[PDB]
Amino acid sequence: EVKDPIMYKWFSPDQIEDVDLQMGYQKTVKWDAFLNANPTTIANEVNTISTIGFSSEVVRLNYLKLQYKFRHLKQTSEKFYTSDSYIGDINNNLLPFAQAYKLASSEIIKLINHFVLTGTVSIQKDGKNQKRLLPNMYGLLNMPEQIKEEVASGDKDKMDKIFEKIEAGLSKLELGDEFSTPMMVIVDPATSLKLVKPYAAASSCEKWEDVLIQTIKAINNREDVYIETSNLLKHKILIYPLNSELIKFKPSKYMLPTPNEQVDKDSTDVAHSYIDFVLGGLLATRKTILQVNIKQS
């Protein structure tokens, strides 16, 4: 009865591969080559030749384990609290185990989705007072070594200025040889409303959305460009490929909420239960995500 995560819509089927780990890390090694100097000319006799060097890098992904506790009614004490229609003490907000677990799971899943998208964990609408997480734990919005574009505050309502920064970021994007792949776009609803105005005396032929699709289609070898709207974002746009070779998601198989065996029981009718979930497992190559921030000063 618990709804599916919406983060499944931000990734391709091949981009997600589950791992078996609760808390710990996983390491990957990537090899690379470089040229030291200009090539040597083979004329007459020579033994001093130019060199080609190699370098190695280690990428480590951190996985963290988290828990929540919630109170509910003891199983044997349900019958003394059931009513005509509702089940549970309305005056004191106490629910059976099944109902309490279901609501709690949905809330945790919403938090899990927020972290994957925004890379942070917080319960404040202001977004402050965040939970200090481990390094090597990044989301699609806080990922380092990616293209960041900032729109000036005075041009927040100028769609042309916004599209200008998008083009600048798209130019700086480097897909290498993996360009032939679909693309994914995530916008806030306010941005989505701006995207349906006619393209700019203003034209009456195409829409800003159509121009954006064509512009992205230039760099993805005319591949599909899916657009998604998320209320989580605020004046921010995300563009990144849907290729596993560039961005891959390796979550723990215990990432989604799971009940814990320990149950706190007392002489009264109130019991407590615990839910476990795992955070982490996002890996992305350098300079493959476009992050546009519209300053709302």
Binding site: D4, Y8, I16, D18, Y226, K253, L256, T258, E261
Partner: peptide
């Protein structure tokens, strides 16, 4: 039918994985 808590956890993870695969199968982009 699970035996102990450990098997119950494994069954849950399998349910999520099959749930995720089904969602992509029914997804129409």
């Amino acid at each position: 039918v699970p035996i102990n808590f450990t098997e119950f956890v494994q069954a849950i993870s399998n349910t999520y994985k099959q749930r995720r695969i089904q969602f992509y199968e029914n997804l129409k982009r």
